[PDB]
Design a protein around this ligand. Structure first.
Ligand code: NA
Length: 330
């Protein structure tokens, strides 16, 4: 089997992407944030505290003929941005892009933090990291990908995120029409439960490539590119008037600037992030200070190849017995 679903930016900045997901019988379609940096499929629901719901579509298990309480199971998760959610668990039928899993753990939120409530466009998350990170207790649950894997034509999914445009998540096949040149594959460590890999270096604009190992994770659920402070300083030094602002919480730059590209290495291959991808617009409405899309990972404890980086590539998440990542230009 295969599946193919379109993923759509939630706003004009590509702050996140949503993908429609069918849950239950008859189907309830919720727009989920596919997150290769976490391993829980959780939803706004009929159980979510009413004051914490503001415009999201909810899953109502009592209206699904295939929903079953997973008795005694609870979940609770905290993300890198400080947001959180928790609740109980149902099993139900979940379909993505025509690919169906029966018996998927659907984590029903009883509580969500303010950042979730305030984002009316995201109805929950669908985690695509390794199932070792799943938070369900006392019986840890599998991701949608891990449950689908054995049925797929190939044990893979691909992320093809758009810049200010829709893109695609495919399951079970490589679309050889969706990228240019060849796919370069690189090793993955699953020791921390992430799609963790090592970039071979970077360049700023038309500058020379610096060969250096940068360990980090491929994380579709993170907006920005978070890299070591040395790398980030080297980037922003090429933008007149850019500075790190402790008041704003990262590098800012004059909205009048033209940003340089940023290149990262994948083995001997190179992915180029156009400068435009690094502009996250005014820090507050009408400001002439703009927020940068490349930020320091110092204090976060890991480097994160988030959407700024991933949307410059066609990315293969190879879930074979020995997982690997692939990157192609597009
Ligand atoms: Na922000």
């Amino acid at each position: 089997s295969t599946g193919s679903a379109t993923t759509t930016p939630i706003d004009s900045l590509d702050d996140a992407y949503i993908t429609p997901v069918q849950i239950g019988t008859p189907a309830q379609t919720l727009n989920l944030d596919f997150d290769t940096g976490s391993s829980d499929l959780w939803v706004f629901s009929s159980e979510t505290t009413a004051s914490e719901v503001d415009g999201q579509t909810i899953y109502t298990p009592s209206k699904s003929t295939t929903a079953k309480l997973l008795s005694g199971a609870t979940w609770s998760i905290s993300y890198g941005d400080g947001s959180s959610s928790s609740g109980d668990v149902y099993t139900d039928t979940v379909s993505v892009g025509g690919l169906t899993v029966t018996g998927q753990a659907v984590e029903s939120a009883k509580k969500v933090s303010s950042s979730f409530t305030e984002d009316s466009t995201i109805d929950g998350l669908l985690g695509l990291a390794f199932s070792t990170l799943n938070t369900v207790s006392p019986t840890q649950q599998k991701t949608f990908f891990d449950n689908a894997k054995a049925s797929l034509d190939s044990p893979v999914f691909t992320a093809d995120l758009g810049y200010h445009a829709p893109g695609t998540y495919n399951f079970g096949f490589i679309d050889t029409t969706a990228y240019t040149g060849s796919i370069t594959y690189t090793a993955v460590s699953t020791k921390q439960g992430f799609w963790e890999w090592t970039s071979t270096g970077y360049a700023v604009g038309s500058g020379t490539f610096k060969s250096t190992s940068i360990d980090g994770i491929a994380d579709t659920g993170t907006t920005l590119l978070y890299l070591p402070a040395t790398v980030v300083s080297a980037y922003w030094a090429q933008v007149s008037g850019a500075k790190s602002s402790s008041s704003v919480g990262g590098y800012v730059f004059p909205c009048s600037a033209t940003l340089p590209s940023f290149t990262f290495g994948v083995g001997s291959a190179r992915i180029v992030i156009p400068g435009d991808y690094i502009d996250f617009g005014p820090i507050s409405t009408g400001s002439s200070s703009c927020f940068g899309g490349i930020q320091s990972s110092a204090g976060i404890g890991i480097n994160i190849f988030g959407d700024v980086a991933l949307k410059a590539a066609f990315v293969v998440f190879n879930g074979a017995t020995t997982p690997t990542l692939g990157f192609a230009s597009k």
